[PDB]
Structures are given as structure tokens and as C-alpha cells.
DNA sequence: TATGCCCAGCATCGTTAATCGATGTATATATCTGACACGTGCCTGGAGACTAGGGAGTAATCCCCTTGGCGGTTAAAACGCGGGGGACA
């Protein structure tokens, strides 16, 4: 349970976590559906 | 004359043996078809050989384009909350 010279570096440009979820919904409505499931996207 | 007694007489039942015919099983032979390999014959579409030429290889230079680093705002992604209306039975 220590500071231990901790350095934090994780990867969120390329990797799919990093990309933006609204970026998708932005996409979803152009099609014009009313609803987005969590599972689906 | 009628009623019990002697002497044949074919069909009743069963059992033995020979015979025509059906069923099962080899066993070497005469068709049936379907070939794949060979030689028959011929064509030339490939092989073989040579040339000539221009594509593509490489090498030597250039300079443009792509990646990088950085920092400021400023929108966007992210989160959550809440409740309605669509999914699903």
C-alpha cells in the first residue's frame, strides 16, 4: 500500500477503449434509429 | 323260418420303401460391357534454335512528403441520474 515510485502510462488513442463512444452514436442517428442498445454498439 | 355259427370282402388305420420333383450348393465354361494400353494415321500447336531490340535492372542524385515534437484553446467524450416507452413474453 505504497507510493513506490509509481508511474502510470495506459493506451487510449488506437486501442478500442480509447476511441470515443459518442463517436459511434454520432454515426447511429445519421441512420436515424431512435434507440441504441449497450450490447449492440 | 328265425338265430347264432363258418368263409370271403373292401375300406378303416398305421408303417416302409422306391420315385419324380423342388431346393441348396459347388465347378469349370460361354457371353456382356467397359474398358485402358498400343499402334494406326495425320496436324501442327508446341519445342528447338537464333536474333534483335527495348524493357527492366541498377545505380546515383534530389527534394518532397510524411512523421514528430510541442502546447491552448475549446469542443468533445464521459458520467451519471431519472424516468418514460419500447422490448419481450
Curated annotation (Swiss-Prot):
Residues that the record marks as modified (N6-methylated lysine) are: 10
**Compartment(s) of residence:** Nucleus; Chromosome
Q: Which residues carry this modification: N6-succinyllysine?
A: 21
Q: Which residues carry this modification: N6-propionyllysine?
A: 6, 21, 34
List every position bearing N6-butyryllysine: 2, 6, 21, 34
Residues annotated with N6,N6,N6-trimethyllysine modification: 10
Modified residue annotations for N6-lactoyllysine? 2, 6, 21
Post-translational modification N6-acetyl-N6-methyllysine, affected residues = 2
Q: Which residues carry this modification: N6-(2-hydroxyisobutyryl)lysine?
A: 2, 6, 21, 34
The chain residues annotated with the modification Phosphotyrosine are: 41
Q: Which residues carry this modification: N6-methyllysine?
A: 2, 10
Name this polypeptide is given: Histone H4
- Species of origin: Xenopus laevis (African clawed frog)
**Which region of the full protein is contained in this chain?**
12 to 52 of 103
Amino acid at each position: 500500500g505504497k507510493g513506490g515510485a509509481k508511474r502510470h502510462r495506459k493506451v487510449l488513442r488506437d486501442n478500442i477503449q480509447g476511441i470515443t463512444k459518442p463517436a459511434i452514436r454520432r454515426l447511429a442517428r445519421r441512420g436515424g434509429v431512435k434507440r441504441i442498445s449497450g450490447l449492440i454498439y
